Amino acid sequence: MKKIAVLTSGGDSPGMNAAVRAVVRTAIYNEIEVYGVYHGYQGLLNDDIHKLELGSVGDTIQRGGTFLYSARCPEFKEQEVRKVAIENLRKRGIEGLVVIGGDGSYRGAQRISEECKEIQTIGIPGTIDNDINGTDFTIGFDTALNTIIGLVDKIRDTASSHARTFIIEAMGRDCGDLALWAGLSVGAETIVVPEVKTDIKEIADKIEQGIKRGKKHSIVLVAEGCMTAQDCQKELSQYINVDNRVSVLGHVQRGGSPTGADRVLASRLGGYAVDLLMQGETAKGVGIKNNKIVATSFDEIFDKFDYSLYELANKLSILEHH
Amino acid sequence: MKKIAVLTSGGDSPGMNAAVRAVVRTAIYNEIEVYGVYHGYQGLLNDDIHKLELGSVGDTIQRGGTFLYSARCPEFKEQEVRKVAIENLRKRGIEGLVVIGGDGSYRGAQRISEECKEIQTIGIPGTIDNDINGTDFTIGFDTALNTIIGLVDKIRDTASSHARTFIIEAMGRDCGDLALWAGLSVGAETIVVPEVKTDIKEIADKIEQGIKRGKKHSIVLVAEGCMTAQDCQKELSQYINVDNRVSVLGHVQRGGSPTGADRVLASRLGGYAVDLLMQGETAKGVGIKNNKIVATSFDEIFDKFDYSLYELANKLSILEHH
Ligand SMILES: O=P(O)(O)OC[C@H]1O[C@](O)(CO)[C@@H](O)[C@@H]1O
Numbered sequence A, B: 001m002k003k004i005a006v007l008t009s010g011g012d013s014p015g016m017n018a019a020v021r022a023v024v025r026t027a028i029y030n031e032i033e034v035y036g037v038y039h040g041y042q043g044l045l046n047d048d049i050h051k052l053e054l055g056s057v058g059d060t061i062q063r064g065g066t067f068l069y070s071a072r073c074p075e076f077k078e079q080e081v082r083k084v085a086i087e088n089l090r091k092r093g094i095e096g097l098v099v100i101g102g103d104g105s106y107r108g109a110q111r112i113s114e115e116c117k118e119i120q121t122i123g124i125p126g127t128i129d130n131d132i133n134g135t136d137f138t139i140g141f142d143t144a145l146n147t148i149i150g151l152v153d154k155i156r157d158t159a160s161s162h163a164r165t166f167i168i169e170a171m172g173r174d175c176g177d178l179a180l181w182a183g184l185s186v187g188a189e190t191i192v193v194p195e196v197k198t199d200i201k202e203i204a205d206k207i208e209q210g211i212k213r214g215k216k217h218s219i220v221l222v223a224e225g226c227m228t229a230q231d232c233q234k235e236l237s238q239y240i241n242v243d244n245r246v247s248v249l250g251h252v253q254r255g256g257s258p259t260g261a262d263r264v265l266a267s268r269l270g271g272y273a274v275d276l277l278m279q280g281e282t283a284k285g286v287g288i289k290n291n292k293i294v295a296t297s298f299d300e301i302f303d304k305f306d307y308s309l310y311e312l313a314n315k316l317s318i319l320e321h322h
């Protein structure tokens, strides 16, 4: 294991730079040469592959985004395209590849380990959405959670001034974790998530009852994987007329300096990926499960919602009580 | 279990209000009357005990500090003093007491459960220092971690401009967790913690070697439980002369709006404390252990440092490499 490469694929998340930094610094500590692959899997195809030195990752732990960049590569599904990637790695004597990203990213890394005997691959879970198996939390979730909390805490100021209900759309793709964690954190009176049956009438009834009880406005926090905020607004309006606004938080949730949890998790996972490569392992995604750093085969990963936490959030809502 | 009381004791931490809110809202959800005790155990003695309603905890989840206040009560060590406290609870028909704070707080709650058959007690771990058993993380740690990261990220700007080394003192009482997590997070080149043998000469040697290698300045992050920053500075100066400054971060680390991790953990623990009281349990501190919500007897609590994480942080330091 003398030479490794690292790339970031899929949507960027805060903490991906800390993960790259830990792969780089851990590899160099162990006298392994490290190559950066730029623009994700597109980099493998275009041969945008460059040796990194210790200084290449200075001034990065605190930075959001990915300094390696990410670009989509749907053509990686063709075995002939993959052969070109493999040869661009093998031309340089690369023996291990670390991929930081989501499921897609892991599928490419699974193909590479299957199609090149001489390359081991390891995946590190990077996404704001918390939707990757093999880990309880993904790199970027904590940061995005705190981004949403900050934004909604601001919205709450204006909601309170005007007794204005807000219907706020959070990211998460098909996962409700961001909406659940953030909604509990901001005291959202209603949280709409794809993992729970949607009953707009019920939500309207709760809101109307609140008003009867002198709760004049509320926050509805809506996971995009369920519906759009604008759809929620339209559906509610069938049942009740309240003074409301829609907010779509958008790509702000993807950015920013990573929190401590993300910088530490990213660092732990990046160093462990390098350790796994040295130990001769392949085709595994790393993670933290029950507060332990673990590795899971891509098979088992491919082949989480905390209903108890959702129950709690509802108990804490004054609308559940009214 | 018809009537419960709640108090905050020991140093305040961000998230204590979210914990009080969850105890209040969970109790009222279960048709239990809740009483706030103000100024910690002093409140029990002065009978500063007032019924809370649902609205008493509005506008609190996001707020730092404790709205119940905290005040020291070393006289609680006298059994005659404790009898007055118990009677102020029993006069009102209180059957359960939730204490949010540290070890001290838990010692009082242990005495109360021993000395009053009719009162069950449960402790919730609230401290920035992460130094309470029965939990992997305390309420406030995540917030304080992110406070330190923000402060040191700023210091790093000025350090970089001037090639100035900073020796920064973090809180934590006798626990190095804050310094470790924050130090890894900011790329501190040296972290000084009470759990590891202190070798100032060694640290000086690493710094001097860095300079030889063109690393002109660094950050030393020092847990107060080891030594003061000013002591570290003085001891280093025996061995090397560098252009340096000392920063003591201080009580800023205690304040601020809690992060999502703290608001969610506080909420989970507050609701679980109420559940334990309903279930007939006593003399237990709650926590999260291996990502599961648990309860531990005060005995077992009274009767954690991640050396692997420390090892990683050192591997990531360019000074460890130079
Ligand atoms: O960056 P894009 O292509 O707009 O995709 C948006 C999606 O990406 C994510 O931000 C990250 O996977 C999702 O939360 C969101 O559904």
Ligand SMILES: O=P(O)(O)OC[C@H]1O[C@](O)(CO)[C@@H](O)[C@@H]1O
Pocket: B011, B127, B128, B129, B171, B172, B173, B224, B254
């Ligand atoms: O608030 P005080 O009495 O100055 O005590 C400071 C101590 O309290 C804590 O802030 C919280 O326990 C410690 O980190 C610190 O050593």
